[PDB]
Amino acid sequence: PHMELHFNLELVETYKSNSQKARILTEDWVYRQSYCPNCGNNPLNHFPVADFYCNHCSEEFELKSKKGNFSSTINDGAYATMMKRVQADNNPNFFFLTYTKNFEVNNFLVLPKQFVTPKSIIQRKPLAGWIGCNIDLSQVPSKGRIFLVQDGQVRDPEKVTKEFKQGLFLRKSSLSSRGWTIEILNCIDKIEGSEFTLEDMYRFESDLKNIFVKNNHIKEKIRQQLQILRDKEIIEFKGRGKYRKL
DNA sequence: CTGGATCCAG
DNA sequence: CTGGATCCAG
Ligand SMILES: [Zn+2]
Ligand SMILES: [Zn+2]
Numbered sequence: 001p002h003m004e005l006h007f008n009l010e011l012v013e014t015y016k017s018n019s020q021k022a023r024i025l026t027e028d029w030v031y032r033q034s035y036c037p038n039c040g041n042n043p044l045n046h047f048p049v050a051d052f053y054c055n056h057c058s059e060e061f062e063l064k065s066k067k068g069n070f071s072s073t074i075n076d077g078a079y080a081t082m083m084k085r086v087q088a089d090n091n092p093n094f095f096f097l098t099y100t101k102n103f104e105v106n107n108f109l110v111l112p113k114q115f116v117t118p119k120s121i122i123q124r125k126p127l128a129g130w131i132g133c134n135i136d137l138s139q140v141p142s143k144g145r146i147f148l149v150q151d152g153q154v155r156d157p158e159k160v161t162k163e164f165k166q167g168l169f170l171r172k173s174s175l176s177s178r179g180w181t182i183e184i185l186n187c188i189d190k191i192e193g194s195e196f197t198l199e200d201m202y203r204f205e206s207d208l209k210n211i212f213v214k215n216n217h218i219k220e221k222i223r224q225q226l227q228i229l230r231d232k233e234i235i236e237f238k239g240r241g242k243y244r245k246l
Numbered sequence: 247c248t249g250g251a252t253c254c255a256g
Numbered sequence: 257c258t259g260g261a262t263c264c265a266g
Contacts, residue, residue: 177259198249217261223249224259241249 003033003154007103023050026065026097029105034095037110037146037164040157051092060092061110070098070107073134082121082133091116108149114170115144117179141185143167169232183211184225188245198241
């Protein structure tokens with residue numbers, strides 16, 4: 001098994017000046033080159049929409065693509081529609097593909113569906129109406145941005161599948177309880193290095209209070225959330241309010 | 247006390 | 257059943 005990072009260069013020539021070129025090329029690449037980031041199965045199945053599923057584990061993936069520079073936002077459709085889906089916990093997993101002017105994939109990631117929170121949905125050039133949206137990847141923790149290819153480097157599929165499976169417990173939490181765990185992961189991402197203290201986490205109290213406005217016991221909530229993450233092997237407790245990222 | 251463990255009103 | 261609240265060991 002060898003991933004080829006370039007698109008089909010013959011299709012590049014055939015579909016020159018064709019309106020659908022960029023969709024044909026990206027879908028083709030995902031179909032032949034991607035694997036299921038849950039169970040590792042290759043190839044995926046095709047379901048207009050660029051939707052795939054895994055015939056082994058039934059995971060679904062919808063593809064989004066951007067030519068050029070890696071963006072911290074993924075273009076979607078309507079704000080209201082995306083919201084209904086997010087609320088109903090109904091989104092597919094998302095594949096995000098970025099590619100160069102020479103039709104090489106330089107980033108390819110999966111955003112597992114449960115990491116798409118109301119918060120991560122931002123309005124695009126909003127107008128009083130007409131309001132598109134993006135998914136804002138700066139609001140998604142590293143645990144929910146799982147790279148199959150990163151900066152032109154093909155990652156170990158065993159690490160991809162491990163990371164994907166590690167986050168699946170969040171599918172069993174309801175919206176706000178899931179939101180808590182996801183925001184704690186966002187805090188931990190900001191801590192520089194491997195080691196951190198409870199004191200480090202308490203610095204985010206003000207930030208967390210602004211998201212979770214009804215919580216008057218934020219320090220205690222932080223402790224509980226750290227315990228959930230320990231139980232899920234995402235951090236370890238070294239005792240006495242000291243932790244290490246895993 | 248500090249911080250890991252558990253709970254319950256609506 | 258949830259997520260803000262309370263319990264409880266060292
Ligand atoms: Zn190539
Ligand atoms: Zn699969």
